[PDB]
Amino acid sequence: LTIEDIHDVEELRAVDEFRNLLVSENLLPPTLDDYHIMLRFLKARKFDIGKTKLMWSNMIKWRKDFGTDTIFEDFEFEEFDEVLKYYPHGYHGVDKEGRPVYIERLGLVDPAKLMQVTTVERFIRYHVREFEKTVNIKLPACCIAAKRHIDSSTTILDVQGVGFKNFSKPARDLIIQLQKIDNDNYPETLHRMFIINGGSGFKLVWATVKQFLDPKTVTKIHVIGNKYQNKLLEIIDASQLPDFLGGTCTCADRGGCMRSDKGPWNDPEILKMLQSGGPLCRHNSALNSLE
Ligand SMILES: CCCCCCCCCCCCCCCC(=O)OC[C@H](COP(=O)([O-])O)OC(=O)CCCCCCCCCCCCCCC
Ligand code: NI
Ligand code: NI
Incomplete structure (x- = not known):
């Protein structure tokens, strides 16, 4: 099934550069290895790769510390x-x-x-x-x-x-x-x-x-x-x-x-x-x- 999903070439370059930096520093869990998740973080820091890596690194620690990755399993409200x-x-x-x-x-x-x-x-x-x-x-x-x-x-x-x-x-x-x-x-x-x-x-x-x-x-x-x-x-x-x-x-x-x-x-x-x-x-x- 084909979903309309237009990728900008400039964004394709930026997101894959960012992904290679995350991989090279073991900051990329395969559960977050999605073009579109990484694009949202880059956009939030106007494609500044240094500030985006900090943002990403804080988010990984946050999901670890908050228990976000097991919250479906762990939390009954x-x-x-x-x-x-x-x-x-x-x-x-x-x-x-x-x-x-x-x-x-x-x-x-x-x-x-x-x-x-x-x-x-x-x-x-x-x-x-x-x-x-x-x-x-x-x-x-x-x-x-x-x-x-x-x-x-x-x-x-x-x-x-x-x-x-x-x-x-x-x-x-x-x-x-x-x-x-x-x-x-x-x-x-x-x-x-x-x-x-x-x-x-x-x-x-x-x-x-x-x-x-x-x-x-x-x-x-x-x-x-x-x-x-x-x-x-x-x-x-x-x-x-x-x-x-x-x-x-x-x-x-x-x-x-x-x-x-x-x-x-x-x-x-x-x-x-x-x-x-x-x-x-x-x-x-x-x-x-x-x-
Ligand atoms: C007495 C009532 C007070 C009235 C409050 C007036 C509100 C003023 C305007 C709020 C500004 C919102 C900023 C932008 C929000 C935003 O980006 O998030 C939207 C989200 C839903 O996100 P999405 O998944 O739909 O994209 O939507 C949200 O989750 C954001 C909405 C804000 C939460 C409102 C909470 C109001 C406080 C409740 C009071 C009870 C607690 C009292 C404790 C003694
Ligand atoms: Ni896509
Ligand atoms: Ni209705």
């Missing part, structure tokens, strides 16, 4: 269902370019009740486990459904009712900690973000958060007020967009759109193409063939 009740978030379908749509209803987050049911350390470990699913299962599924290389998401943050008066230091510090893990270990995995239902109270939340955010990430973020429905329908088909955001989806037989995890990674035929199907990338296939 048994409070999951309770957390969802006070933190509504999920993947739901794809945008018109085939990227997964990730939603959070931050207006419906109950900070007090969330800290009764979980800890910040556990929520972060859960976040890392979901990212491992996102890069190993959900994004490759999207590659197959679109017949096109996909490795980044469209995110919607619903911030209805969120104002600066009740924007707390722990809320801010969690965002910083999540972004640090994401920038350090999962770079170039956000395509764009739409922050919707921002009231006048949100203006200072956005002001303060921008002070800590990676500036390339800020350039990918669009903050919208209450009239957001048409902008989302421009970039997401109505069938892939929950009705409460202006689409036609209800996921009625699956507990509503926020609990369905709807997307091509729920399709058994697409999942079968991931587990025991051709390699998705013709350069990895060529490298693995040659070696």
Whole structure:
């Protein structure tokens, strides 16, 4: 099965130079020996091979120290269902370019009740486990459904009712900690973000958060007020967009759109193409063939 995966010659040179440096210093586990993983790290450091090797080396140590490589095996987040009740978030379908749509209803987050049911350390470990699913299962599924290389998401943050008066230091510090893990270990995995239902109270939340955010990430973020429905329908088909955001989806037989995890990674035929199907990338296939 042929997947549209255009490789730039300049990037082909840069990525293979970077890979040879990683191999020569025993920094390349075969589980991370993918053109596209290495390209995301190079892009995050503007193809500076010295800074990228440091970034890569810190990520390897991080995965060793955090236990990321055994997190599927090791971590059972048994409070999951309770957390969802006070933190509504999920993947739901794809945008018109085939990227997964990730939603959070931050207006419906109950900070007090969330800290009764979980800890910040556990929520972060859960976040890392979901990212491992996102890069190993959900994004490759999207590659197959679109017949096109996909490795980044469209995110919607619903911030209805969120104002600066009740924007707390722990809320801010969690965002910083999540972004640090994401920038350090999962770079170039956000395509764009739409922050919707921002009231006048949100203006200072956005002001303060921008002070800590990676500036390339800020350039990918669009903050919208209450009239957001048409902008989302421009970039997401109505069938892939929950009705409460202006689409036609209800996921009625699956507990509503926020609990369905709807997307091509729920399709058994697409999942079968991931587990025991051709390699998705013709350069990895060529490298693995040659070696
Ligand atoms: C009371 C609610 C507070 C409202 C907060 C206001 C938010 C302000 C805007 C946030 C800036 C986000 C920066 C860019 C985020 C980014 O790159 O990551 C997007 C990810 C999902 O990534 P992907 O896999 O979809 O690509 O998506 C994420 O995971 C990022 C979203 C940020 C997490 C929000 C956490 C809010 C804090 C919860 C409060 C409860 C804890 C209180 C403890 C006493
Ligand atoms: Ni739905
Ligand atoms: Ni490729």
